[PDB]
Every structure is written in structure tokens, then in C-alpha cells.
Design a protein around this ligand. Structure first.
Ligand SMILES: CC(C)C[C@H](CP(=O)(O)[C@@H](N)CC(=O)O)C(=O)O
Ligand SMILES: [Zn+2]
Ligand SMILES: [Zn+2]
Length: 388
């Protein structure tokens, strides 16, 4: 009778596709965790043992790429009791995230990159796709092999390096150390096929983006490799961010900060400013700590950041700021996919991974496909970690 199960065919039809481009109502044939066909009216019987999903009435779009998640945990600013746990596969998929880039933070003493690489590989095995950034806030960077350059070049899941500047938790790095680091990651990327990016944690420091502008003057690293995150933390910074974006740089906006500049507000304000969307990205900063400080560097409150804020922003964009479901999706999909050169991600077209999300017209996640495997059903995850 013949068996074609290994192929795992899947016909997702009758959905209003946003790839993100508004592609009207059309189908998507998925086989081997890959999108093998996108057109309207793919014959229900074009292939054997195919599984058809009557998505008629729902919306289909690419999964999310969260390039800022503390996969193994974070916090620690207020003692050992403030060490946030690790993230569970479920609260990721269940949040529309299919691709994620993990990093460390303030704590590099009781958090090592070697155990971040692990979770990263775990999260891969279990379904989604993960990558990590070497080092953390501390500069010189605390690596895995002893060289930012060597790390990015040889450890497969390392695509860049992270550091922290203009914050009272920085190691007070100087132009040189900052520049050297930034360059090792670029070349590392060149050798290993990684993006070679340098993510910069930003702080409420008066100096703002000064270190970056300075670093540009002290080396030759392409501005297209310098990513300032958390840019929405304070007004004077966000405005310099735009100016940085106007010179050709990409800026990462954290959706876990609701004031003084909302994520939704932030993104819109950038478009109106004239920045294209391909230079704007939204990160979550999952499982990270939300600590606040007064004027003497005293910590007052502290908590944890969740992922719910990604979709919210997207919703608050379509409504309120009169965007298109399409443009509103870009900052979490095609934009991020282009900045970190992630292939098979960000766009729905023949050849890329079946990282798909099924939502109601009102933008409520109902189903989440990750590289083909069904991860979320009816709004609740149907595939959890290994020890959840
Ligand atoms: C925006 C602000 C309220 C929170 C940010 C979050 P973060 O840099 O990601 C830090 N929580 C990461 C970590 O856990 O080390 C901060 O610590 O400055
Ligand atoms: Zn940070
Ligand atoms: Zn962070």
C-alpha cells in the first residue's frame, strides 16, 4: 500500500497569509519541516498522506524571532534571591516565539556562557530554533574559549557578543576594549558564517550613545553590526537612537518597558521619523529582571519580564497607531531575520522553515507550528519542555 509518513506532509489552507507581505488568501504546503509551496488552491490530494488543516477564516504569518532572551536566567542585582529561573519551551511557543537568541546579563559570576550554550542546544532539540551571544555586560568579555573572536568563529550557536555601556553596572570599559571586542566578533562572524553582531545594553546614563559614536571613530567595524538595545528606556536616549538609525544603524526596542516611551509608540515614532522598518526590531528581554534605581544607585523594586508584551505591541500597532497587520509584523520577523542573517527564518516562501502562527482576525494566537511540529493548539501549548 506504500507509506509516505516520514515526509510528514501538511496542507495549511484557506488562510489570509501575511508573509509578512499581505499575500491575500492562499495556501501553504509544508513537508519535512520546510515550506515547499505557496500559492492559492493547492490540491488537497497533490501528495499522499497529507494532513490538511482547515484554517479558513484565520490568519497565518511567520513565527517570532526574539533576539533578546535570558534563556538560562538572569537578575541578581539584589542578592542571590533575585536570580530569575530559566525559560520553559512552552512559554516561548505559547507566546509566538519560534526563534530566539539568548544572552547573559549583569551576572557573569554565577551564570556562565557554557550553560547558556547548553540550554540553547536543548531548546533546539525540543523544537524551536535558538542561538546565543557570547559574554555579558562585563567587558573584557567573559568567553567560552578565551577569545570573543574565537568564540564567534568556532562555537556554532554563537552569532555575536554582548556588552553593556552607559549603565551603573558596566565594568567601565574604555574606547579601546570596546572597539577591540567589537572587531573580534565581526571577523569571528566572517570566519564562522555568523552575523558577527555586537549588542549593547543601554543605560539611563547621561552619556547615552556616546561610546558607540566614539567606537566608530576608533575603528572600522560596519555600523550595520552595532545594535543598541533597550533604546526606549529614557527619552534623551531614544532620540539619539533615531539619529543613530538615520545614519544607517538598526535599533532594538525592548517591549518590556512601558514608559517613558512605549514600544508601540517607539516604533511608530521611528517610522514617522523616516527610518525604514528593516532597521527597527522589537526584543522582549524575557526572564530578565526589571530592577529600578533611584538617584544614589539604590535598587528599589525588582521583578521579571514576560513575553506577553510582544504580541501586545503588535496589536497596539494595528489599532491605535493605524498600521497594517503587515508592517506591524516586520519588527519581530523579517527585520530581525535580516539583521542577524538568519536563513529559513522571517519570511514565508518556498525554502524556508515552517515557523508559522495561526491567529484570529483579532490577532490572538491559536496555533504555532515550529519547523513543522505542532507546538501550540487552541491557544495552549501542546508540547512542553522535558521537565516542565
Ligand atoms: C529597562 C530596565 C527596567 C530593565 C533592564 C533589563 P536587563 O539589562 O536585560 C537585565 N535584567 C539582565 C539581567 O538579568 O542581567 C535593566 O536591567 O536595565
Ligand atoms: Zn540590558
Ligand atoms: Zn537583557
Amino acid at each position: 500500500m506504500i507509506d509516505y509518513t516520514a515526509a510528514g506532509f501538511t496542507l495549511l489552507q484557506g488562510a489570509h497569509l501575511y508573509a509578512p507581505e499581505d499575500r491575500g488568501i492562499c495556501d501553504v504546503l509544508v513537508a519535512n519541516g520546510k515550506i515547499i509551496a505557496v500559492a492559492s488552491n493547492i490540491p488537497s490530494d497533490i501528495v499522499p498522506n497529507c494532513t490538511v488543516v482547515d484554517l479558513s477564516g484565520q490568519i497565518l504569518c511567520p513565527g517570532f524571532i526574539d533576539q533578546h532572551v535570558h534563556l538560562i536566567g538572569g537578575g541578581g542585582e539584589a542578592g542571590p534571591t533575585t536570580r530569575t529561573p530559566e525559560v520553559a519551551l512552552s512559554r516561548l511557543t505559547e507566546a509566538g516565539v519560534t526563534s530566539v537568541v539568548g544572552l547573559l546579563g549583569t551576572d557573569s559570576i554565577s551564570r556562565h556562557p557554557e550553560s547558556l550554550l547548553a540550554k540553547t542546544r536543548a531548546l533546539n532539540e525540543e523544537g524551536i530554533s535558538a542561538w546565543m551571544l557570547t559574554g555579558a555586560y562585563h567587558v573584557p568579555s567573559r568567553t567560552i574559549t578565551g577569545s570573543v573572536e574565537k568564540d564567534v568563529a568556532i562555537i556554532d550557536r554563537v552569532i555575536g557578543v554582548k556588552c553593556a555601556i552607559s549603565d551603573h553596572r558596566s565594568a567601565a570599559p574604555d574606547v579601546y576594549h570596546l572597539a577591540n571586542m567589537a572587531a573580534e566578533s565581526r571577523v569571528g562572524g566572517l570566519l564562522g558564517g555568523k552575523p558577527g553582531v555586537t549588542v549593547f545594553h543601554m543605560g539611563d546614563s547621561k552619556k547615552a550613545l556616546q561610546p558607540i559614536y566614539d567606537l566608530l571613530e576608533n575603528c572600522d567595524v560596519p555600523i550595520s553590526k552595532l545594535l543598541p538595545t533597550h533604546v526606549n528606556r529614557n527619552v534623551p536616549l531614544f532620540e539619539q537612537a533615531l539619529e543613530f538609525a538615520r545614519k544607517g544603524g538598526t535599533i532594538d526596542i525592548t517591549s518590556s518597558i512601558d514608559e517613558p516611551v512605549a514600544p508601540a509608540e517607539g516604533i511608530a515614532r521611528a517610522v514617522q521619523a523616516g527610518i525604514p522598518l528593516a532597521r527597527v526590531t522589537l526584543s522582549s528581554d524575557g526572564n530578565g529582571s526589571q530592577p529600578f534605581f533611584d538617584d544614589e544607585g539604590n535598587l528599589t523594586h525588582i521583578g521579571v519580564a514576560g513575553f506577553e508584551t510582544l504580541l501586545e505591541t503588535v496589536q497596539v500597532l494595528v489599532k491605535d497607531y493605524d498600521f497594517s497587520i503587515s508592517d506591524a509584523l516586520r519588527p519581530l520577523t523579517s527585520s530581525v531575520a535580516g539583521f542577524l542573517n538568519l536563513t529559513g527564518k522571517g519570511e514565508i516562501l518556498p525554502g524556508n522553515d515552517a515557523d508559522l502562527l495561526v491567529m484570529t482576525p483579532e490577532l490572538r494566537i491559536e496555533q504555532v507550528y515550529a519547523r513543522g511540529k505542532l507546538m501550540v493548539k487552541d491557544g495552549k501549548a501542546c508540547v512542553k519542555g522535558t521537565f516542565e
